[PDB]
Design a protein around this ligand. Sequence first.
Ligand SMILES: N[C@@H](CC(=O)O)C(=O)O
Ligand SMILES: N[C@@H](CC(=O)O)C(=O)O
Ligand SMILES: [Mn+2]
Ligand SMILES: [Mn+2]
Lengths: 873, 873
Amino acid sequence: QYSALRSNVSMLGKVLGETIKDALGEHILERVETIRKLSKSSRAGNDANRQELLTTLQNLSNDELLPVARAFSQFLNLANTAEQYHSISPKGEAASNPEVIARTLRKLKNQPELSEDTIKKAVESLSLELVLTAHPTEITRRTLIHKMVEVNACLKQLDNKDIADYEHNQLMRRLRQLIAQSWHTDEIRKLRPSPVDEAKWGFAVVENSLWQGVPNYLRELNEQLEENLGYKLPVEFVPVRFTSWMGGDRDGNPNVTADITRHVLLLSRWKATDLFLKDIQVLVSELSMVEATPELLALVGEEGAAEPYRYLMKNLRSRLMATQAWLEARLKGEELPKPEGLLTQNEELWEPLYACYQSLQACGMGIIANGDLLDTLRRVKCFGVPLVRIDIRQESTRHTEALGELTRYLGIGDYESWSEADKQAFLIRELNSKRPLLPRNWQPSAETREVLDTCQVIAEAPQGSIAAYVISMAKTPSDVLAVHLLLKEAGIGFAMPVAPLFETLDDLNNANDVMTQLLNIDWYRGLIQGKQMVMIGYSDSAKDAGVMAASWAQYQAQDALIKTCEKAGIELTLFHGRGGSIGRGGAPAHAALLSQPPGSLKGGLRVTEQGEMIRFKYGLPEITVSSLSLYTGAILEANLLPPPEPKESWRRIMDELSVISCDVYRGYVRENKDFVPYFRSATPEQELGKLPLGSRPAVESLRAIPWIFAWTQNRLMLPAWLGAGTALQKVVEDGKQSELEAMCRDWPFFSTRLGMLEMVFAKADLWLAEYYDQRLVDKALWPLGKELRNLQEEDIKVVLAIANDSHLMADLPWIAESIQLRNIYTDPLNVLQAELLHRSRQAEKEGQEPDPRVEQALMVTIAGIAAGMRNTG
Amino acid sequence: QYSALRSNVSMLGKVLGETIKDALGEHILERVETIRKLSKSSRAGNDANRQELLTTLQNLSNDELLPVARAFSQFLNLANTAEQYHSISPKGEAASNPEVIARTLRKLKNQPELSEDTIKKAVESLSLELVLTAHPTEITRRTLIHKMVEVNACLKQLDNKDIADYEHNQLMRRLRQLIAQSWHTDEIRKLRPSPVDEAKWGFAVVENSLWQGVPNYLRELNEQLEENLGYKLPVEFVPVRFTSWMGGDRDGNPNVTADITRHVLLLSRWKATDLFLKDIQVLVSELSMVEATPELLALVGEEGAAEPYRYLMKNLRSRLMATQAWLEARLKGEELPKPEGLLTQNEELWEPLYACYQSLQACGMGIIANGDLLDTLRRVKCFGVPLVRIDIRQESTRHTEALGELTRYLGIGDYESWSEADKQAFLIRELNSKRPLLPRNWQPSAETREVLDTCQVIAEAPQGSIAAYVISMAKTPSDVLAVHLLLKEAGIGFAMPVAPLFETLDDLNNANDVMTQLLNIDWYRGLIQGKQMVMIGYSDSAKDAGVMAASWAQYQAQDALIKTCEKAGIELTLFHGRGGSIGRGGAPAHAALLSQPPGSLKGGLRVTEQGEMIRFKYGLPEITVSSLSLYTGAILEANLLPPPEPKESWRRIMDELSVISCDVYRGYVRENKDFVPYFRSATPEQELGKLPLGSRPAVESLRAIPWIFAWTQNRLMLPAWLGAGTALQKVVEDGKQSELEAMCRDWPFFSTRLGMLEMVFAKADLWLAEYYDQRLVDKALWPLGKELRNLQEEDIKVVLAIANDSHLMADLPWIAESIQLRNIYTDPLNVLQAELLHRSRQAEKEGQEPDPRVEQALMVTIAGIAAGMRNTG
Ligand SMILES: N[C@@H](CC(=O)O)C(=O)O
Ligand SMILES: N[C@@H](CC(=O)O)C(=O)O
Ligand SMILES: [Mn+2]
Ligand SMILES: [Mn+2]
């Protein structure tokens, strides 16, 4: 079964080892082989080999550090590519086999009490919007997407049995070339990337995978609809849209200025012109058809009425080339009027393209119409003019300060002192006011000016470039009303979707109250035009209260909001954030989406795909088809077959669990006096902040990402499990274990919550965790480490006991197996990383010079460990 | 065995039939199915179905003609692509399996009396130069190369056994798209192509196949050298070069003016810039290596000494972009000074590229150096700056007139009246003269000015753009001396290779005499710098005297020339022309090259690849590797293992054969009074002249091409067999059959000559031939037709008797089989073509209007028949 995968990893590793021998050494290969041996030994109890391991690492010269690190990082890299190849190959788990869609559609179709029209309308109302996010540990300076597409193509071809030995030889020769490139093509950011750089990586994902991936997803989905149900969605219906937060999210990031966003907004347009030209060229040459309709001929009428379809593609070609030229100037900083055929809306690309499609169908050229034209048609609506719409995100606090400084300058009062009823009073008065408020030539502070300039970019940008304004830390109705006032002042002609982001236990708790007041304001209700979009901050609430309380809190807030909006007639859209069980990808994800309160996906799927998981969910075009197909079935099933409502006793088990768990979690994280000092020593948290990892500049202070990432590198995974098990053991100790087991079998929310601990417990590593304490933590803090490690050992038993199994995550053997592989490949990077942190941390203590070798090897481990661990939050 | 091929043709035909049903009809499919049935019946003797066939064709409306024709043309097209796919697939004849090289190298290596150094120097002196020629029946307006690469890729992928049904489904969906494109993408020249258009098709061959093909050929050849012999050729040795006659050959073509050549010369440079940029971009991003040599660092020294290889690739990128810009202006007709980094020589691309290679090897990055850099390195020397050097070609007569008009204007005398000793006298005097001769502001006639302007282009063009000046119809030493005088007058700074083209039996006969006089002129001998290049006009001499006399005449002239130049110390290079057994491609070709007089390829292989055979020899990159590999073994074997010298009695059998055969051939073609009238009626010769087939404007008059092509369409193949058999039967009738059989077993020249008749007799078709007489020829000319057809029936027996076989070409079963397939697919185009010629020819007789439908269907048959028949001369 996993034999083929085991063979490929072994094959790619020999090739790497070959390349390293050629490269520079047999010595480094020995540096690598001694470290694995010693590490395996040490773990298996040999305390003499632990000594040996410690001396071996300490004797590594600084010149050996990076090459050794990169080696370990590379072996892991081939392991993941062997892992991902296996996943889409038909003689392996086969993630992109269209049965994934059909299995879901068959289930529905033969489910009594499910009218076919009920099914058809759910189909016709599908909607997915995937919001790309930056990768927090992207270490190189150029995107590697395209090389990966290539290694994968080579593995695909070597899979053909009966391949003539010469073909085999040829394939292996390129494979060695491609691996060598990676060992020698070293790039390492020296400096913190910038929002433009991160915006650029998203364009790389779009062109190396989404560009082909989306249209294929749409063809397969369509072939399946018609096969299983008897009808194809209409050409005009493209249910997928991609959006990006890159150069749009300034929450906590001073480097994302209104100037940067302006810039990135332009760049996207430039890149869409680039990709759309490649599509249009193809079309200009293949559309030599001369048979056309009255309507189409009319549309050209003479001049090009002797090459009709070609005509309309040539016109578009110029129109695209003109706008390209204009944006390359603006990118450059030059201002010059815009050409007559400047492209700003998708309708401008759609229209002509759709006209050709229509005649070709009408005139008997169906097959040609449904080929590359169809693909460009779907890409216009999926990507269009802006390529990827961006989302703007700023904290609520920042809006309050801007509007406070404004009010004091006008002598009206001080907004950040007024009670909430006064703020709404002031906001509704001004929102209805016809006289401006923003002083024409004002002198605000840097911060305020930024808030003000950003809304001017939004307002200045063509409609459909910006998908939504997200308000992180939204706590009251004035928080939402505040951005509508600023946008009004910025001059905006359309209705911009504003979304509160509730990301704390109380804000989640108060969320429903906050929106019912907002919908009771008649002015607000008519401004949103029957649609609201809320954002649920799972990851931050879990930082606040622990994962159990956060999950139940989020469960309750969505159910309350779904019901509130339904009473009020508003189409609610839940915007999902980062991690959680909805961001696990694959089957768990599909289980997860279905485990949400009934109603939850009635207004669509909108999620924040984590940066570090992009390669694994959209890395190759076939993975994109898998990912979109999985999501698509989930929506459909969740909307026609919602989960049951919880048995009241369950609710009381969850209330309690939530209190015990939050109580234990805060016990340690907030109340325990040794925790912060422990944390800072045991995890590479401080270094993740100094090093040039994300574009943000170098426990309540911290952000979800750095909280999660730091514990992931240490291997304890504290954030993702902490009070859950403790609370669960206690409830069992009351004899309620039988109810916990019923909740698991019959309540999707609950099994899915327990499922997720299993995977975290599956990647955590207590031997490694203990090793960092031994090397990095002061002796007096060891007891706390031992305590937290023992908490986990006990939490795995309760979880295994409730799950009635003896092996963790036994329902997902392929995920289990793949986690087993990466764990062994990741092993040596954690062993090495501890030495680097030690060398690094002692240089500082003794006012030394950040050695560049030591720092770069550390960035390699960080990024390798993060890649081997994937999702851990 | 041929099962897989039979399956694929059936598969592609169903898909075509599917597409046509969708398209416009079930009626046309019936138009096609009735015509094959009736045609098969008629042939098999049913004279009632022959009547039915005749009425069926006559009842076709003019609106049915083209679609019916195109259908038959398309089925043939899929048949050839199934045929060509099978040829390179490892589970079929496998043309590009590197054993082709190794088999040859093994043979050599273990051949006693063959020192390994003798072998190594032959290796180090290999040299191939393939001169591309236009396609005489290219009917569409855009090159289809690239689509064909794609259909082939799709067949390759469907060959994988174990292909998951979804993959299979996906592949078939594109296949249907691709076929549909061809049925609906109709383009048909309305007008005669132009030299630029034909120059453009050669660029299409270069980029869709030679660009990848050459470097692969070079890697395989290199891997084989080292495997079998123990050494690899050095990086600086690229033994292949491609040249084109497109926009260079004006022999007989008024449309190829000096202006056109100037233009085409520029365009090639533009296109090389285009392809070289794609290579350089790749290099600019993959060469991130920072480890470099003193020498390389020196070469950059600071500025870019922190990204050395990238630096040199970025410099070249600008340099290429600059020259591109300059040629797009010149192409446009604008004159503006040339940029500082204008590229004119290959050394300018070589140099930097080679520097990177050197450091990468030196610094341990061998594997990266030997990858894409190696490929660009080899392409520079194979294609370089000009992309494809062109060759200029003008008749000798035209030079005599230009120089006659010149002399009369100066009052010196009249060159075209002076005896040959006087012409040489005058020419040597002026060639040594320091005072000019060409009047500064003269008024010649159009013709003369063209001769004069063309030499000015040659002279004006950068050195290495023009490979040689070919003199068609060269008869005496003054013919060669004449072009050296004109070139001198045109101002030329380098030594341009001039080559006489002997293309008549007497000129072949006199060839040796002509060159010994030329080498006895001390002035000439020192001007050519130890190198002469002669051109052998097989195809035209055969038009003159028939194929046997021509072949023996050519055999004798090369042997005489090889010997003459060897005595004189000149490196002779035989330039081969069109068709003949050297242009058969594949194994016959390899046999053919080896059957030439010893010495023959000592100065390399230079051949004129026929236009209509390009798809079949260089159509896909893998076919190019096959073709170059076959040629390469032939050179090596021919140079280390020459054929035996003929037994004197053989020579006398050949003299006689040559006289009898020429005698019979001229009997019919020149002396017979009914022949011309017959010819013009039975073949589409006149129409091939009117229709927009080649770029030349709309029996001694005629040219090889039109002589051959016309008889190929009729199916009799007269030009390629005519007196051969007649002469052979006569010699058997003297009891010398036993000597003819010995000559065949032991004399390569002879078996190869008889081999070639077999293939012509294999594609000829006497039933079809008779059908054209019945439909197109007047009753009184029928007897001549019957006579010529009966000549052939008798010639096949003598040939089969001498070959001791009962089935034609029994030593080449795959070629035999593939000829069988195409013959059945071509069948209906000949049946249809006869009706078109009838309708066309009667419209004219009755002063009607060339109906465009009738003419376009005719162009389709012409081009289809020419494609099914491939090489027939
Ligand atoms: N994404 C997997 C874990 C992994 O593949 O590393 C899960 O959510 O369970
Ligand atoms: N090129 C083949 C004939 C063919 O393939 O049609 C030969 O020279 O014998
Ligand atoms: Mn937050
Ligand atoms: Mn000629």
